[PDB]
Amino acid sequence: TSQVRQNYHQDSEAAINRQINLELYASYVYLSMSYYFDRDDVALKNFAKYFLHQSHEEHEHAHKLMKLQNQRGGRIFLQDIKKPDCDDWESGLNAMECALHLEKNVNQSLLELHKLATDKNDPHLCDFIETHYLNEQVKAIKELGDHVTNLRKMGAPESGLAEYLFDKHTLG
Amino acid sequence: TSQVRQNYHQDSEAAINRQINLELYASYVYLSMSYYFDRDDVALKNFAKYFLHQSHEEHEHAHKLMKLQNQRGGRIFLQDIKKPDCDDWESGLNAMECALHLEKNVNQSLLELHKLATDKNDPHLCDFIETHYLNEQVKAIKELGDHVTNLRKMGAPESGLAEYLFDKHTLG
Amino acid sequence: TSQVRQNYHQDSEAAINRQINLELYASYVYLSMSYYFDRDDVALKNFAKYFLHQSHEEHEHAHKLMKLQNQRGGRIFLQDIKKPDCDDWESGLNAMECALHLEKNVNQSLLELHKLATDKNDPHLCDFIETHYLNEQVKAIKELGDHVTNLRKMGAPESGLAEYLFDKHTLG
Amino acid sequence: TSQVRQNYHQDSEAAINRQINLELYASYVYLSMSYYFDRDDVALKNFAKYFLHQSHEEHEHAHKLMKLQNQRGGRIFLQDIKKPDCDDWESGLNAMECALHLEKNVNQSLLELHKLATDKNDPHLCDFIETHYLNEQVKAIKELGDHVTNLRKMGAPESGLAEYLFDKHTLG
Amino acid sequence: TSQVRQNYHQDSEAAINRQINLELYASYVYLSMSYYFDRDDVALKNFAKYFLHQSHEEHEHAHKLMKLQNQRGGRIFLQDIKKPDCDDWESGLNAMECALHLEKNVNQSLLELHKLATDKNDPHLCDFIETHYLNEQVKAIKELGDHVTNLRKMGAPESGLAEYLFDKHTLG
Amino acid sequence: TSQVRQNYHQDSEAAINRQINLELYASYVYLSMSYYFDRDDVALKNFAKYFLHQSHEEHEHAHKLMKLQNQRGGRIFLQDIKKPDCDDWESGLNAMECALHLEKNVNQSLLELHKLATDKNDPHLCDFIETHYLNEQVKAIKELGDHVTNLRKMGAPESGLAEYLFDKHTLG
Ligand SMILES: [Fe+3]
Ligand SMILES: [Fe+3]
Ligand SMILES: [Fe+3]
Ligand SMILES: [Fe+3]
Ligand SMILES: [Fe+3]
Ligand SMILES: [Fe+3]
Ligand SMILES: [Fe+3]
Ligand SMILES: [Fe+3]
Ligand SMILES: [Fe+3]
Ligand SMILES: [Fe+3]
Ligand SMILES: [Fe+3]
Ligand SMILES: [Fe+3]
């Protein structure tokens, strides 16, 4: 056992590894979206920039989880990062909706992780989750919901002008 | 009687208290509007910012009236601040129209207050109203009328693109 | 249901609305106190400044709660803001004691809110309360207790010199 | 009872006093270590500096706990600060291992304190512990584990060159 | 077909997609190494920093390849990013040797890509590879060879002092 | 024997260890006083600040004595730091009188130490005491005497206004 390990349950360690994989997968999905909007037949540059920034943030989250795993004496076990569900995201609105769904899935995973940590009486893990992930997820979900609402009201995806103007004014 | 009270009629004091309550109520209505536009299913951030600023200004007006009440030797009697008429303001255009109606109501109350002060031969109160409230109300009414006209001409509330672009370009 | 709503119980939403009303009421009470000390027959300017700052802070707390309600997909339902219990607060010491009682009531409401959020397994709400409200309430209660102790030891409210010197040296 | 006391159990107060004594004892142990490495027959100046800084930090932790005790209306009851277990710490590696053991003991005490606060439904105390002590303890334990690992791999304590170079390069 | 596609063979597009996957896999391997050296029982911080920087650079290479794919009218097809071959890299020297092997594999893949582009008479692709990847790979291979040589000469991996001093002086 | 030891008698070493314990005890007493005045039912913040500064200075004195012990080749032997005589110091005036008594006790111990060093013909120890401790003690005793005189003349401890004004004007 690790010399620094204290009040760190094996189930918590396994759940942390699963969360690391999930964050990496989310980063990969965002990368796919970003370079979808970089295509010459899509050409929505600020959508691409937004999703690239999201990918970078997801990577940062994964990094922080790995650092936590090392801090508590757990051992990182990396797994395959599955490819995203789609290659063609079909519109800015569809990409935003998919991102909202992904963020809610990540939030649900984090909530299950917090429940596990509470059941295992690991207050440090609970505080780590609350401080670094829960509010970030809530803010991200709210922002994506706002984006989806605005895109729908402007007339997307049928109205290409709507997505162009949202690209310029909101994401620009 | 207050040692500083001079040429301050009881009717003027009561009307000032009523005006204080009205200004607080207007601030509360603007707060309700602002956080209506902060909703994820509305998501018009500059509308929310505009109405929050209006709420802040109404609060300042109430504060100034209370300071006047103390200056003249009157006694402040606070009353319940009634909740706004609506929880859902249904659109940017509807909110702007409601704000215009509210500002005209406040202006009418201020005009009645000025008439009372003139009838009571209280030139300090008349000058206070004219200097601090009447022109501010006229400017606010003109601005809200301009906003309503522009929103109607752009196609609001049916055209969501109209409200989005007004949010960005005029209120932004 | 709101597209952003996740792990947000209806009971939590209702309790948040009640807390919003309570914070607004506390701001209104502090406003009443502040302008009581602005009276010509009281004339304790730093007491007025202190209570005005407290009113502003309570308003900020209410605003933050409304923002949280929107973030989680809940719906804000505003209610009447009841007028404060007293128009005449009768002394600096009495006002400080009333403020201490009010802050302890708000703290108890926040503790009940935290208990509800814990029972509903809403870690984001629990963390929000702990991060933004609990320590602020503890600090405010401690500060008001210190003020009350100092005023009592100096001889307030019978000794007007005590309240004058406390106004100058502590609140100044 | 204290006028500011609210939702503060007597058991929590007693546990806080015990934790204050433990933090003071840890500071005293670190002081002993630091001045052990200041000896002419040991002469590892950066080891002494490191342990002096640790003693200072432990003192800060004790101070923060006493401030918390006063904030919540509890009463501080100081006890004797027992002398450290050893006068001669025998090596840099042995001192680091003893510091790791001490930090893990302090962490276990803090975890028991958090469990008690959770059982007593004192969310402010739980948040205080999580925000100010748990992550600091985890980081300290990880750092001491890293130091112990590096010292062991370099050949300490038999290799004096190892401790000299660790003194210069890591602690310097 | 893409409106911007010109002199871009399908085989080149497929090879570019394979290279993108390879660069992502290399970044993932470097990430695994970096957090291996962050472990409390390894504790070689500059090794971790070095491999984290390498992971970041590999990610940048992948990004540049995806940008090229979009520029030429090709379509990005992402695949699973396989997990690294090892979880425990067993030493700084072993990690450096594995990194050298990985970089030589990437270089061989790039050379095959250049051969394919030359066979397909795609001078833009050839120039892209030469300008952005070939010299970077040569420099990386030379640097890793230097690191391996120095670690072997210092006595690694048996001599822990060797790896500590290399961590401090070369990677620091 | 230590390689640096020269003209350092064992009795001097023992007396230095006793003085180290006494300085630590004085720091602990001052800490107790400081946090007594931080209580919500005492609330004399500048008294608390003054006694905290005194505790810090006593700690510095202890540190300097330990450094001297190491410089001369003596060996530091730490003992238990006894808890202060009182938990409740009952007033600012009583705390000041107790501090005066404590400082005079420390001064008497230092004078006995100087007498011992003179009897042992250790001029370095005598000069150390004279340069670093004797004048500091005289100044501290004079300052505490001035504080006690002023508090008594102002009407403390019966007059709470006296202690409040002394807190503000002298200790502020
Ligand atoms: Fe990325
Ligand atoms: Fe994430
Ligand atoms: Fe407002
Ligand atoms: Fe107004
Ligand atoms: Fe206010
Ligand atoms: Fe509040
Ligand atoms: Fe210290
Ligand atoms: Fe500590
Ligand atoms: Fe990376
Ligand atoms: Fe590469
Ligand atoms: Fe101290
Ligand atoms: Fe001293």
Numbering used by the authors:
A (entry chain V), B (entry chain C), C (entry chain L), D (entry chain D), E (entry chain A), F (entry chain N): 5 to 176
Provide passages from the article that reported this PDB entry.
As an iron storage and release self-assembling protein cage, wild-type Ftn (wt-Ftn) comprises 24 FTH1 subunits with 12 C2 axes20. With the ultimate objective to create a biocatalysis platform that could be expressed in vivo, we report the rational design of an artificial human ferritin heavy chain (FTH1)-based metalloprotein to achieve histidine-specific aza-Michael addition with α,β-unsaturated chemical moieties. Utilizing the large area the C2 interfaces cover altogether, mutated FTH1 subunits were designed to assemble only upon divalent copper binding at the C2 interfaces hosting their histidine mutations. To still allow these sites and/or structurally induced nearby residues to chelate Cu(II) for catalyzing histidine modifications while allowing the ferritin cage to reserve its self-assembling property, instead of modifying all of the above-mentioned four copper-chelating histidines, we attempted to replace only one (R63) or two (R63/E67), which are noncopper-chelating, with histidine analogs 1–3 (4-thiazolyl-l-alanine, 1; 2-(5-bromothienyl)-l-alanine (BtA), 2; 3-methyl-l-histidine (MeH), 3), separately, via genetic code expansion.
